[PDB]
Symmetry: C4
């Protein structure tokens, strides 16, 4: 019976099945939004999700006594194991933040299609060489986030009242969200010189992300 179930799971049709059904829940989760549909077609939907989730649980189980060691030595499987388990945690308890986390099974659709796997890995390909740069960036912030909190955060706390408030803002500025009228002009009107912070900060921090796509296109 070991090899009967091995053919079962690894078949074209078990794939087409699970992929058809990832697609389906992914239209019903669409329609769940509709707060009218939830009156008209409400109940079909709520247990459709339980119907589909068990299938996935067994699809996960069927996969596991086949591969064994092999299964959890795959990132995409593990994430599927991770994702559908996230949904096995009950609707009650914990936080709602578990109810809405659930909808990460649509990433399952991604892992299910090998074309997505091909391209998604190209995207994760690129990351590590940037860990060099990436994790300096993550300190320039820390250093410069602190300077702000003490400098401003008395008078302008929403923005820099805090280690973490300074971060959220310095990010804000990094992306040049609405930093000009929104964030320095109002400061200078109290602390006239804080342009010696940000114009510098804006310089370092666009520079780096520029010499990021340069040295991204060498790999």
């Amino acid at each position: 019976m070991y090899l009967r179930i091995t053919n079962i799971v690894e078949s074209s049709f078990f794939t087409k099945f699970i992929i058809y059904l990832i697609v389906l829940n992914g239209i019903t989760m669409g329609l769940e939004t509709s707060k009218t549909f939830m009156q008209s077609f409400g109940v079909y939907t709520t247990l459709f999700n339980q119907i589909v989730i068990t299938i996935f649980t067994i699809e996960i189980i069927l996969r596991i006594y086949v591969h064994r060691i092999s299964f959890f030595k795959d990132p995409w499987s593990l994430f599927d194991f991770f994702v559908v388990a996230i949904s096995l945690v009950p609707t009650s308890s914990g936080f709602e933040i578990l109810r809405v986390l659930r909808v990460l099974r649509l990433f399952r659709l991604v892992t299910a299609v090998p074309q997505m796997r091909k391209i998604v890995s190209a995207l994760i390909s690129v990351i590590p060489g940037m860990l060099s740069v990436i994790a300096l960036m993550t300190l320039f912030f820390y250093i410069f986030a602190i300077m702000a909190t003490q400098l401003f955060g008395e008078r302008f706390p929403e923005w820099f009242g805090t280690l973490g408030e300074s971060f959220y803002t310095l990010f804000q500025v990094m992306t040049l969200d609405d930093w000009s009228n929104g964030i320095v002009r109002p400061l200078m009107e109290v602390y006239p010189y804080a342009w010696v912070f940000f114009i510098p900060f804006i310089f370092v921090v666009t520079f780096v992300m520029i010499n990021l796509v340069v040295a991204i296109i060498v790999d």
Copy 2:
């Protein structure tokens, strides 16, 4: 009669005549925008529309009698057809939008003028060299558009009321438009943990698009070498 009309079509005149009308109608359309004009020199242009449309409607039939089966298997032709024909839509009734789609006719400057046709072909070449990632986004976007509506849109109705409003808002944040003060800071006053739906939804967005583009440079770069 075929090779007689097959001569009216291909002539250096007929293209220089059809094209030079496009320009001559652009100007014309650049003046249907003051009210001043439609007052004084109004019906003047009202029917100059009606002229340059007949000139095309016929022309498409001429090429259809030349190329025929060849005509509906070229993109640039199929466009001129569609775009002329959509102008054939009637002035009265219909929909007020179809009355405004007209100045798409000014796209035949692309289609007739040769150098503009070439760039378009260049520019449309990159498309499927990305079309996986184009999808990967709308899936990702989708999984993130629900997630928004069932979190925020209860309180914050305009921004995240529906699938629709969530997507559009989630686009806004992509261009990095007003996003922090304008959309998220507000979310933080009721929901201090929204910088977890967003500072990430950011990097992911701007990791991809950067790779979407280093692709464009790469696929376009990839074609250059390796021929030795």
Copy 3:
């Protein structure tokens, strides 16, 4: 005498001398922008300006003697010409910009100095490569501008009232400057489908801009 006026001009002294006048008139006008400086030194500095032109005026007469027709067959020189053709014009009457166009002079730091010439004409040299596209956009821009203008200029005339409005507003959206909340959500208050003009327009324009750079990068 022709071959003295050739020698006076060609000297490595002459250039240094010209570049000295510019880089003074450069410093001098920084101080002209000030409010207080023109109280005190508004005597000398209104003098000094009128010399620096008188001299460059001579320089053009001589350099024309030297190269004759080769003068108005050279870009860089014509720029020196028309920039100085401006400053001559008397101080009062007509438009107030001709008295500000004065500062256009300072760009003689570029023409005069080789390696400013080179990197400037290195920039400009891609424009011929870009006609093939600027053409197309100004066709695209002009075309949406018409549609925008009829469709919205009735309820939103400060923004889409004429062509002019529509162009700048469309020029805005292209810089993703406050397009959404600023310009479009207000439009969705009255014309709900504007996300189908404004998004897609927004797509295309950036599309181009990327592929613009992906052939500037081969070129």
Copy 4:
């Protein structure tokens, strides 16, 4: 006795003793941030820092002997001398921004750890190749930065008062921060053709900003 102090300073323990101190006093200054942490355990914060500055002024006097002439001709040390010197000023009088610089030391985690040094110099490196077109633009940003002050400074004072106020603004227009509604849309009410002034400017400053980026990609 000279080569005994030259055979510890160079070792891999003396080094990891700073890099670890760095990382502790690095962690400590983010705890200062907490207002709760300053009236609970502020004592060990004041001292830990106090000891660190002892260790570091010792370290630096220790590396001066081993290195001497090799020391005061290195970037990373002239950095480290001043970056630490700053924390030794009396802390009374002067300016309170003396006291804030004290966190520029946590930059040393970059100095004293070699991968960061080669990732950091991988950016300073491609800076002498750019200081050309940093000249061309800083020229433009001046020339206009005059006109702006003298086309809109009597009435549009905040944004364009002083020469400076023209700088801080045009940069915001350059960063494309809120420019159109923020800045141009308002000027246009009083002076209508300000788009002619600004809009071109926003071609020049971004074209150059794009090609100067291409000049990075082949070199």
